[PDB]
Amino acid sequence: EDKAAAERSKEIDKCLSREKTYVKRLVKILLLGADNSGKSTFLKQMRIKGIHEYDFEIKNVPFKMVDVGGQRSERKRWFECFDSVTSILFLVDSSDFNRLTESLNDFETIVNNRVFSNVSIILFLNKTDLLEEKVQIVSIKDYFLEFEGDPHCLRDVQKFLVECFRNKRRDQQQKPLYHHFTTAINTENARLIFRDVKDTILHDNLKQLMLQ
Amino acid sequence: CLFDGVNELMKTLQFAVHIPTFVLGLLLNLLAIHGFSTFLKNRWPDYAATSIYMINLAVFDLLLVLSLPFKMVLSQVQSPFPSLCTLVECLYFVSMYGSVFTICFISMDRFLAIRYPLLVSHLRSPRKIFGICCTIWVLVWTGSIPIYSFHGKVEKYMCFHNMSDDTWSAKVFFPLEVFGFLLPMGIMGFCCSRSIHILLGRRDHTQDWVQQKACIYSIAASLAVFVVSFLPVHLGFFLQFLVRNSFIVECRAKQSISFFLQLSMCFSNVNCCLDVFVYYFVIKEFRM
Amino acid sequence: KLVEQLKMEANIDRIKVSKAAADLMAYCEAHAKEDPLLTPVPASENPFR
Amino acid sequence: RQEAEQLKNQIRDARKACADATLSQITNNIDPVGRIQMRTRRTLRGHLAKIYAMHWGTDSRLLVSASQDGKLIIWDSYTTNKVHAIPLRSSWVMTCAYAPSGNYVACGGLDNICSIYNLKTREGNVRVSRELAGHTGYLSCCRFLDDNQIVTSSGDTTCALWDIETGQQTTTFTGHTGDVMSLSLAPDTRLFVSGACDASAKLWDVREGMCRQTFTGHESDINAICFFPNGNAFATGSDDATCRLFDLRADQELMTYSHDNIICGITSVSFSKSGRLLLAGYDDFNCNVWDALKADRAGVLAGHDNRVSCLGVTDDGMAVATGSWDSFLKIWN
Ligand SMILES: CCCCCCCCCCCCCCCC(=O)OC[C@@H](O)COP(=O)(O)O[C@@H]1[C@H](O)[C@H](O)[C@@H](O)[C@@H](O)[C@@H]1O
């Protein structure tokens, strides 16, 4: 009887609509980073086979970290099915100078991709402790000739790295970029991620308010 | 006492201000309604909620503009039409305070979206905005009960003149001032100043906060016009109130207060043109 | 491996593009009247209309 | 290297010799189809995100669709009733398939696993029958041969034929250098053809596990592929806004279906039951119906609010279903 089929379709629609309030409030963050960036310790200190997913809650908000653990090497638009994510979170080993250029070369590929035009960028510079050791041993000028401050000051090297990452981003009028300098303790990164996502949602609201 | 020269000079200024105000406001508000109807028709699910109350504000300003010619005409020649005079006064004052309340609601919506971005990003839909617009219409027309009885049964229906001793009573004046200026002034100031503070405080979160620096100026402009459009009138109202309750007695003071009140009421109808500038034109270009 | 693949690919009994074209024409015309998209079906025999 | 060059030259010369005249030169004797009226007979609603794949049943009534909310939905196309709603373990689903018997469905995606679900269970619910693992890249396409044999194409440049009961790859099809995007079985179930991001397609025989022929001509990656109804030809759609009809026998391109005002890539292709209408979905929010024998854009299927990613034609040819990124499936007739 078609009456039973219509009823069953109705309970199916009710079940689907019960998850709309979750699909609309869910924040998906695409996590990128090289093997030396400390992704493992980062995820472990978040209190947490194809690609991986991690589900967690910050202040009654659901976050879903999508970790493309090596399968991002297929740099094709079909794989670039992450245009609906709220943020892209980069992990960069800031202390290991020999690879910053490589990291930058990766950054420029992701943020300037047309797919991620509506995605804000959160940038984490891991192993800041290994920075304060590395800065006093070697000069950042030995790898980047554009540096202008004193190479043995941590703050100047940090601002140089931040501007190096920010300068790889064309079209600086779409979405905000967030940078943080974090160590292996990593005890506050969920708070920082929540703050950056809240600011991204604020930016989207301002876009939606027609203020400019 | 004597009010002849004040009335003649003020009638001249009423024409001189309202005629350009009428034409410019009519044109600009028709363009604004066209543009935001264009935005809504596409059902862009970002611009619909804002476009609904921008349309509401434009409609209220358009109603005020349409009521302006009747105010110019019926205030010079006596009208043996109590119904027409009451209709004109209702259209004028209802449109003015509907614009005030729509502006206040725009500021409340901006402050809510800025201060509570998660909640607003979840619980904000075009149907709620349309419901709030309908509530504004219902409330502004409910507040128009006192304005069917300005002149009472007196046949001297010279529109917008010599209202009554009942209209200028405290029981009507204080609800008019508090719910017409002071409450929206406080809400407007709080929402705009807090939105400016919050959007400026984003320099500690990201270096891309400058992207929204324009969003500062617009909001600040929203205060500046709202203060200049509506502060002098209600203060003016206050002054005239003090005249009608035998608190101010001098003839020169009465003449100056009446002139200032009428001039202020003329100037606040320029708000129907300042609204399409503070809003409606701070967006990208508002492509015509 | 490439040489072997190309060797086996080359050894195929190809037909003229005109002949294959005629075959496609014949198949398209033979089943033309059974195609509900070339000739839309009235609502009396249309399950969606 | 010299032998490879000589073989390529011989193949191209045989292609030129066969190319005495093309279809567009001898099909002038056929009356053009004209301008086709297709209307939205139904609009299937319920998906919470973009729709990436659909597949019709062999009864021409049931329809499976896959969406980014992590769900397959099986619809009755006639009554719009949702027959089933299968939640997926992986919300990153790129393909879905429906068994010719209707007993099973399949899906896959960035999980590198082909999940096969059994629709005929005593308990009355859909249960995960198998999880075919063994592919290294993501899963791009998936097509049942029968209730126990399934062919899957992946982003590891490798295709495979799987025995469902065993769970292991029956045979492996290698030879592509880029990500294999699309897969189409021949309507005799002895051959299939795959498009693999190399501006090239390859034909593979199922039992021998060897690539019979390789076709080239495109400028970009091939996103979609399908066979002509008789199995003697196949059509590809790539990102250069160009459809191409190739012959199995002529070993070369037969037609190019391109137009000046279309520049976006092709997300899907399909044929009609007689094969005269080649339907292709485009990134520009609407589908186009081409006269497969005249390369003329004889119709347009507009009505989606986003990119048309899915396109399928019923086995009887009655209707055409399209799926787009706005979460709505539209049935057209
Ligand atoms: C919940 C929502 C709340 C709000 C809803 C919207 C409804 C608005 C209600 C409107 C209240 C009435 C406002 C009162 C002032 C006014 O309506 O207009 C001033 C002025 O026009 C009157 O002045 P008045 O003292 O009556 O007369 C003068 C001169 O008019 C002569 O020219 C003469 O020269 C002078 O000596 C003297 O007689």
PDB file of N, CA and C in Angstrom, chain A residues 5-6 8-9 12-13 16 19-20 23 49-51 53 64 66 74 76 78-79 81-84, chain D residues 46 48 50 52 68 71 73 80-85 91-92 94 110-112 124 138 179 181 325:
ATOM      1  N   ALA A   5       4.154   3.340   2.307  1.00  0.00           N
ATOM      2  CA  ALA A   5       5.369   3.880   1.708  1.00  0.00           C
ATOM      3  C   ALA A   5       5.498   5.373   1.970  1.00  0.00           C
ATOM      4  N   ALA A   6       4.394   6.114   1.845  1.00  0.00           N
ATOM      5  CA  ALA A   6       4.430   7.542   2.142  1.00  0.00           C
ATOM      6  C   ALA A   6       4.734   7.789   3.613  1.00  0.00           C
ATOM      7  N   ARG A   8       6.501   5.831   5.617  1.00  0.00           N
ATOM      8  CA  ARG A   8       7.914   5.522   5.813  1.00  0.00           C
ATOM      9  C   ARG A   8       8.799   6.639   5.278  1.00  0.00           C
ATOM     10  N   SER A   9       8.447   7.188   4.113  1.00  0.00           N
ATOM     11  CA  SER A   9       9.148   8.366   3.618  1.00  0.00           C
ATOM     12  C   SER A   9       9.063   9.513   4.616  1.00  0.00           C
ATOM     13  N   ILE A  12      11.488   8.880   7.427  1.00  0.00           N
ATOM     14  CA  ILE A  12      12.830   9.112   6.900  1.00  0.00           C
ATOM     15  C   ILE A  12      13.119  10.607   6.823  1.00  0.00           C
ATOM     16  N   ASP A  13      12.143  11.394   6.363  1.00  0.00           N
ATOM     17  CA  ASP A  13      12.318  12.842   6.306  1.00  0.00           C
ATOM     18  C   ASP A  13      12.478  13.437   7.698  1.00  0.00           C
ATOM     19  N   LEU A  16      16.006  12.734   8.755  1.00  0.00           N
ATOM     20  CA  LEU A  16      16.925  13.626   8.053  1.00  0.00           C
ATOM     21  C   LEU A  16      16.872  15.039   8.620  1.00  0.00           C
ATOM     22  N   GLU A  19      18.810  15.931  11.838  1.00  0.00           N
ATOM     23  CA  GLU A  19      20.240  16.171  11.710  1.00  0.00           C
ATOM     24  C   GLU A  19      20.572  17.476  10.999  1.00  0.00           C
ATOM     25  N   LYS A  20      19.567  18.211  10.518  1.00  0.00           N
ATOM     26  CA  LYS A  20      19.832  19.503   9.893  1.00  0.00           C
ATOM     27  C   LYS A  20      20.425  20.493  10.886  1.00  0.00           C
ATOM     28  N   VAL A  23      24.097  19.530  11.041  1.00  0.00           N
ATOM     29  CA  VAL A  23      24.863  19.824   9.835  1.00  0.00           C
ATOM     30  C   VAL A  23      25.049  21.327   9.665  1.00  0.00           C
ATOM     31  N   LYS A  49      44.279   3.633   5.620  1.00  0.00           N
ATOM     32  CA  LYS A  49      42.865   3.647   5.975  1.00  0.00           C
ATOM     33  C   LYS A  49      42.181   4.900   5.440  1.00  0.00           C
ATOM     34  N   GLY A  50      42.686   5.415   4.319  1.00  0.00           N
ATOM     35  CA  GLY A  50      42.125   6.626   3.758  1.00  0.00           C
ATOM     36  C   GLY A  50      42.448   7.842   4.611  1.00  0.00           C
ATOM     37  N   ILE A  51      41.575   8.840   4.533  1.00  0.00           N
ATOM     38  CA  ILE A  51      41.743  10.061   5.312  1.00  0.00           C
ATOM     39  C   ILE A  51      41.122   9.860   6.686  1.00  0.00           C
ATOM     40  N   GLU A  53      39.263  11.490  10.365  1.00  0.00           N
ATOM     41  CA  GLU A  53      38.394  12.510  10.927  1.00  0.00           C
ATOM     42  C   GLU A  53      38.467  12.456  12.444  1.00  0.00           C
ATOM     43  N   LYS A  64      35.017  19.297  13.521  1.00  0.00           N
ATOM     44  CA  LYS A  64      35.433  18.084  12.830  1.00  0.00           C
ATOM     45  C   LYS A  64      36.715  18.375  12.067  1.00  0.00           C
ATOM     46  N   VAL A  66      39.468  17.286   9.614  1.00  0.00           N
ATOM     47  CA  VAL A  66      39.632  16.375   8.489  1.00  0.00           C
ATOM     48  C   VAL A  66      41.114  16.343   8.155  1.00  0.00           C
ATOM     49  N   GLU A  74      47.302  13.793  -4.330  1.00  0.00           N
ATOM     50  CA  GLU A  74      46.494  13.862  -5.546  1.00  0.00           C
ATOM     51  C   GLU A  74      45.917  15.272  -5.675  1.00  0.00           C
ATOM     52  N   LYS A  76      44.276  17.283  -7.358  1.00  0.00           N
ATOM     53  CA  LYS A  76      43.248  17.400  -8.378  1.00  0.00           C
ATOM     54  C   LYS A  76      41.999  18.043  -7.791  1.00  0.00           C
ATOM     55  N   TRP A  78      38.891  17.324  -8.257  1.00  0.00           N
ATOM     56  CA  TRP A  78      37.973  16.319  -7.729  1.00  0.00           C
ATOM     57  C   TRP A  78      38.294  15.977  -6.282  1.00  0.00           C
ATOM     58  N   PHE A  79      39.580  15.859  -5.941  1.00  0.00           N
ATOM     59  CA  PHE A  79      39.958  15.673  -4.546  1.00  0.00           C
ATOM     60  C   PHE A  79      39.670  16.923  -3.726  1.00  0.00           C
ATOM     61  N   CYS A  81      37.395  18.551  -2.664  1.00  0.00           N
ATOM     62  CA  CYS A  81      35.990  18.534  -2.279  1.00  0.00           C
ATOM     63  C   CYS A  81      35.797  19.104  -0.880  1.00  0.00           C
ATOM     64  N   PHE A  82      36.711  19.975  -0.457  1.00  0.00           N
ATOM     65  CA  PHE A  82      36.703  20.557   0.877  1.00  0.00           C
ATOM     66  C   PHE A  82      36.318  22.033   0.845  1.00  0.00           C
ATOM     67  N   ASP A  83      35.608  22.458  -0.199  1.00  0.00           N
ATOM     68  CA  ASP A  83      35.231  23.860  -0.318  1.00  0.00           C
ATOM     69  C   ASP A  83      34.197  24.293   0.715  1.00  0.00           C
ATOM     70  N   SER A  84      33.590  23.354   1.435  1.00  0.00           N
ATOM     71  CA  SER A  84      32.599  23.673   2.451  1.00  0.00           C
ATOM     72  C   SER A  84      33.186  23.765   3.853  1.00  0.00           C
TER      73      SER A  84
ATOM     74  N   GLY D  46      15.707  16.180   0.234  1.00  0.00           N
ATOM     75  CA  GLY D  46      16.035  15.455   1.444  1.00  0.00           C
ATOM     76  C   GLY D  46      17.515  15.376   1.758  1.00  0.00           C
ATOM     77  N   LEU D  48      21.154  16.724   2.590  1.00  0.00           N
ATOM     78  CA  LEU D  48      21.569  17.857   3.404  1.00  0.00           C
ATOM     79  C   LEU D  48      22.813  18.554   2.868  1.00  0.00           C
ATOM     80  N   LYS D  50      25.810  18.636  -0.880  1.00  0.00           N
ATOM     81  CA  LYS D  50      25.995  18.420  -2.307  1.00  0.00           C
ATOM     82  C   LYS D  50      25.786  16.952  -2.655  1.00  0.00           C
ATOM     83  N   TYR D  52      26.930  13.975  -5.137  1.00  0.00           N
ATOM     84  CA  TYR D  52      28.090  13.665  -5.963  1.00  0.00           C
ATOM     85  C   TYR D  52      27.869  12.521  -6.938  1.00  0.00           C
ATOM     86  N   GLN D  68      27.171  14.429   0.286  1.00  0.00           N
ATOM     87  CA  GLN D  68      28.241  14.746   1.226  1.00  0.00           C
ATOM     88  C   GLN D  68      27.802  14.750   2.682  1.00  0.00           C
ATOM     89  N   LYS D  71      25.360  10.144   3.253  1.00  0.00           N
ATOM     90  CA  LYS D  71      24.160   9.344   3.084  1.00  0.00           C
ATOM     91  C   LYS D  71      23.963   8.959   1.627  1.00  0.00           C
ATOM     92  N   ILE D  73      20.660   7.666  -0.502  1.00  0.00           N
ATOM     93  CA  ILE D  73      19.208   7.623  -0.412  1.00  0.00           C
ATOM     94  C   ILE D  73      18.679   6.900  -1.637  1.00  0.00           C
ATOM     95  N   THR D  80       8.221   9.907  -5.506  1.00  0.00           N
ATOM     96  CA  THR D  80       9.130  10.748  -4.723  1.00  0.00           C
ATOM     97  C   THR D  80       9.380  10.133  -3.344  1.00  0.00           C
ATOM     98  N   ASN D  81       8.804   8.972  -3.045  1.00  0.00           N
ATOM     99  CA  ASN D  81       8.968   8.367  -1.731  1.00  0.00           C
ATOM    100  C   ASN D  81      10.387   7.848  -1.543  1.00  0.00           C
ATOM    101  N   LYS D  82      10.970   8.155  -0.389  1.00  0.00           N
ATOM    102  CA  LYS D  82      12.284   7.632  -0.047  1.00  0.00           C
ATOM    103  C   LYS D  82      12.171   6.190   0.424  1.00  0.00           C
ATOM    104  N   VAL D  83      12.561   5.262  -0.441  1.00  0.00           N
ATOM    105  CA  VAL D  83      12.541   3.840  -0.123  1.00  0.00           C
ATOM    106  C   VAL D  83      13.532   3.502   0.980  1.00  0.00           C
ATOM    107  N   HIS D  84      14.742   4.054   0.909  1.00  0.00           N
ATOM    108  CA  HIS D  84      15.761   3.796   1.919  1.00  0.00           C
ATOM    109  C   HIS D  84      16.610   5.037   2.145  1.00  0.00           C
ATOM    110  N   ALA D  85      17.231   5.097   3.320  1.00  0.00           N
ATOM    111  CA  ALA D  85      18.200   6.136   3.649  1.00  0.00           C
ATOM    112  C   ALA D  85      19.336   5.491   4.424  1.00  0.00           C
ATOM    113  N   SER D  91      31.735  10.279   5.314  1.00  0.00           N
ATOM    114  CA  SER D  91      30.917  11.324   4.714  1.00  0.00           C
ATOM    115  C   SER D  91      31.510  11.854   3.418  1.00  0.00           C
ATOM    116  N   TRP D  92      32.702  11.394   3.043  1.00  0.00           N
ATOM    117  CA  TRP D  92      33.357  11.822   1.809  1.00  0.00           C
ATOM    118  C   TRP D  92      33.127  10.755   0.744  1.00  0.00           C
ATOM    119  N   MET D  94      32.203   9.791  -3.162  1.00  0.00           N
ATOM    120  CA  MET D  94      32.404  10.306  -4.507  1.00  0.00           C
ATOM    121  C   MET D  94      31.635   9.542  -5.568  1.00  0.00           C
ATOM    122  N   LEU D 110      36.879   9.006  -0.386  1.00  0.00           N
ATOM    123  CA  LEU D 110      38.213   9.272   0.133  1.00  0.00           C
ATOM    124  C   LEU D 110      38.654   8.249   1.172  1.00  0.00           C
ATOM    125  N   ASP D 111      37.794   7.296   1.519  1.00  0.00           N
ATOM    126  CA  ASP D 111      38.144   6.228   2.444  1.00  0.00           C
ATOM    127  C   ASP D 111      38.917   5.097   1.779  1.00  0.00           C
ATOM    128  N   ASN D 112      39.045   5.120   0.450  1.00  0.00           N
ATOM    129  CA  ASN D 112      39.749   4.100  -0.328  1.00  0.00           C
ATOM    130  C   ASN D 112      39.091   2.730  -0.214  1.00  0.00           C
ATOM    131  N   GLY D 124      14.954  -6.284   7.855  1.00  0.00           N
ATOM    132  CA  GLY D 124      14.274  -5.146   7.275  1.00  0.00           C
ATOM    133  C   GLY D 124      15.100  -3.884   7.176  1.00  0.00           C
ATOM    134  N   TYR D 138      41.657   7.332  -3.402  1.00  0.00           N
ATOM    135  CA  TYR D 138      40.217   7.431  -3.236  1.00  0.00           C
ATOM    136  C   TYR D 138      39.501   6.683  -4.355  1.00  0.00           C
ATOM    137  N   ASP D 179      45.102  10.009 -12.125  1.00  0.00           N
ATOM    138  CA  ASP D 179      43.976   9.594 -11.303  1.00  0.00           C
ATOM    139  C   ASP D 179      42.818   9.137 -12.180  1.00  0.00           C
ATOM    140  N   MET D 181      39.290   8.678 -13.165  1.00  0.00           N
ATOM    141  CA  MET D 181      38.095   9.420 -12.779  1.00  0.00           C
ATOM    142  C   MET D 181      36.796   8.696 -13.083  1.00  0.00           C
ATOM    143  N   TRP D 325      24.768  20.327  -6.831  1.00  0.00           N
ATOM    144  CA  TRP D 325      25.361  20.666  -5.544  1.00  0.00           C
ATOM    145  C   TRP D 325      24.404  21.398  -4.612  1.00  0.00           C
TER     146      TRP D 325
END
